[PDB]
Amino acid sequence: GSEWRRIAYVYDRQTFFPLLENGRLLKQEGTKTAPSDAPVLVGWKDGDAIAEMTGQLAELPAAVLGAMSEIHYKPTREYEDRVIVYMNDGYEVSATIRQFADKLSHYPAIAAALDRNVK
Numbered sequence: 001g002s003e004w005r006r007i008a009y010v011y012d013r014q015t016f017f018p019l020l021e022n023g024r025l026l027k028q029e030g031t032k033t034a035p036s037d038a039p040v041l042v043g044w045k046d047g048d049a050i051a052e053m054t055g056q057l058a059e060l061p062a063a064v065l066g067a068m069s070e071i072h073y074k075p076t077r078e079y080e081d082r083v084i085v086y087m088n089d090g091y092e093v094s095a096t097i098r099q100f101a102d103k104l105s106h107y108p109a110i111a112a113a114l115d116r117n118v119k
Contacts, residue, residue: 007057007065009040010050016040021058023051039085040070049073052097053083060101063113067104 004020011017015030019038025047034040039057044050057065069086074094076082081097085104095103104110 005058006038007062008038008054008071009035010044011040011042011070012044019050019054021054023047023054025050034069036069036088037066039065039068041073042070043073049081049097052081053100056097056100060105061111061114063117064101064104064107064110067110067113 004022004024006018007021008019009016010019010025010027010030012027013030015032016035017030018026018035019041020026041050041053053071067088069088072084072086074082074084079096082094083097083100084092084094087093087110089109093104093107
């Protein structure tokens with residue numbers, strides 16, 4: 001049988017709930033460790049918004065979305081879907097759930113992960 005591929009996570013109850021490409025949030029499949037293989041969604045009450053973010057990760061280069069420790073939900077009066085990602089290099093970047101892919105896609109260093117990981 002076919003299934004969805006995990007491309008993100010959700011920070012809740014001191015555990016990272018595996019997030020599928022379709023936003024399938026697994027609260028029961030959570031872990032007590034930050035998955036360096038995929039991103040995390042810090043502060044998220046609206047799973048609808050979660051499914052949106054993960055959706056962007058399902059389209060953008062896996063390496064790109066893979067280059068980040070955890071994402072911090074920081075909306076604003078002008079960007080209700082403003083998310084601040086934490087690069088694996090130790091930097092802080094900002095993006096939106098609407099153009100999350102484009103946001104990190106424009107990053108030459110992040111996308112570079114695709115250039116290094118040749119397959």
